[PDB]
């Protein structure tokens, strides 16, 4: 997926990325239904709000 | 896909409204005459809840 | 050393008041007739700020 | 889509798959009830 | 200064770098380095190091 | 869609060239008389960079 | 004894299953017998378990 | 005594006497020469610890 706006992660396990970035999706639909997805970018893996992508 | 970010803290004054903490991201759904928007709150862990809030407690983000 | 924990979210209605998020710890300083206490907020990163809040938004902790 | 050559993942979170495999894009993807990442060139 | 403190109430850390501990726990102090003067301190317990609110402990004695 | 895999380690001798580690996958773009190919490197995390390399440091893969 | 070690320099792990730690850290050993002779060892620190280059820590008995 | 450097830039070996290095890897230092050329033992995961020469300006040292 391509990142529409740049994001900066709050926690340790959140995925910081710049705008336009191509990210490889890793999962969806958490245990709690929270809207966050998981993916890899620049050799760092984490979670991000799914509303910021494609 | 219209998306705002919470700029200032807002505790909900009713059952129809979101409670917001600075930093959080909101997907916008409806906008009203009052200065009052409906949105879906993307916050980590809690299920995505959908409610009303004063628009002057958020900032939009543009592509 | 009297110490309460925030049980529900409270955004500050004035300049004299703390603004609280669930989980946070408050050291209590004064209590008033209203249902209104003064406290010092122990929250991570920010300098310890000292202000008023409705007491029914916190729970005490006993040794 | 359909895998042209078979791949074996290096990391824990990479998606191993055989040749010809149909993969559901979520890169992004599930195969045989394991989700992972894979070079999109394959 | 002072090497150890006993935990009056149990605490659960919010971040990754906060120190979770049970009640009564003996904790070894490491830093009172005012970060932004936020009233946390740093210490070791059960072989995990972290920070915790200084209001939850007392200097050890009897 | 022509695709080679790095067979041996190659550090880049210039600003026009890729620098390769065994295992990595290259999409081929141009091939020259020298023994020298241009390719796009598919490596995890880094943005896809596009450069030249000695062809006898890779093996092709056939469908 | 044959159990803990003190980290001389700080290390940051490359893989998922490598153990990141700060300088001076006390680490519990879990395997130091053999892991394919590649000068790595395994241990716990701060409630995360992983592997690390055995070069980076010093021994400490008793 | 325990002298230890970290690879700062990628170096492919130009001979049979030399290590071939990837950024991040850790090297235990054994000898240093006039050239700018050190011998070291490479601590890399998986492979057996191999011992060879490399240009010193492709590594950074680490101090206790």
Residue numbers in the entry:
A (entry chain G): 6 to 59
B (entry chain F), C (entry chain B), F (entry chain H): 3 to 65
D (entry chain E): 6 to 31, 42 to 57
E (entry chain A), G (entry chain C): 2 to 63
H (entry chain D): 2 to 65
Question: What text does the study give?
Answer:
FCHSD2 is recruited to endocytic pits by the scaffold protein intersectin via an unusual SH3-SH3 interaction. When bound to the membrane, FCHSD2 activates actin polymerization by a mechanism that combines oligomerization and recruitment of N-WASP to PI(4,5)P2, thus promoting pit maturation.
The fourth SH3 domain of ITSN1 (SH3d) could pull down FCHSD2 SH3-2. Isothermal titration calorimetry (ITC) revealed a 248 nM (±75 nM) affinity (Kd) with a ∼1:1 stoichiometry. SH3 domains generally bind short proline-rich sequences rather than mediate domain-domain interactions. To understand how this unusual SH3-SH3 interaction occurs, we solved the crystal structure of the FCHSD2 SH3-2/ITSN1 SH3d complex at 3.4 Å. The domains form an extensive contact surface composed largely of hydrophobic residues and a few charge interactions. On the other hand, single residue mutations on ITSN1 SH3d (I1078S, I1078K, R1119A, or R1119E) could abolish the interaction with FCHSD2 SH3-2. Additionally, mutation of residues located on crystal contacts (FCHSD2 SH3-2 N613 and D583; ITSN1 SH3d T1086) did not show any effect on binding. In agreement with the interface from the crystal structure, wild-type ITSN1 SH3d could efficiently recruit FCHSD2 to the mitochondria while the interface mutant ITSN1 SH3d R1119E could not.
